[PDB]
């Protein structure tokens with residue numbers, strides 16, 4: 380799987396994260412990220428994908444050791460953590476053929492797992508529009524505890 384890079388952008392209170400909503404297979408909400416190009420450095424891919432999807436340039440705020448990285452089905456996704464971005468920042472994708480909407484979400488209200496269907500005695504998970512974000516929520520909460528308190 381080709382690795383993906385992007386960012387977890389938080390506001391100044393550390394309460395809210397910035398998610399983007401795509402189309403079709405990417406119809407739910409997730410952190411801005413995308414596939415690394417041949418010979419492209421991780422930090423440069425993260426800034427490019429984030430700038431293409433949000434219009435916000437993270438390059439001057441990226442800290443090299445501040446990221447969460449997950450291997451999901453043998454694909455690596457690494458999101459650089461970018462705190463302190465003002466809530467009134469104007470975000471605009473380059474490509475509205477790819478991005479429907481861009482919003483702040485309260486971290487404490489985002490789920491960190493999908494719910495089962497044990498009310499229905501059926502296996503599997505109910506749909507959740509935050510599916511792609513979910514795997515990063517607990518690790519992010521733990522990372523913010525250790526880094527900030």
Ligand SMILES: COCc1nc(C(=O)NCc2ccc(F)cc2)no1
Pocket residue numbers: 399400401402404405406407408409410411412432477478510511
């Ligand atoms: C069931 O898994 C498929 C799925 N993927 C997604 C998804 O990535 N949404 C966020 C997003 C990130 C970057 C973009 F450019 C566009 C959208 N939502 O559902």
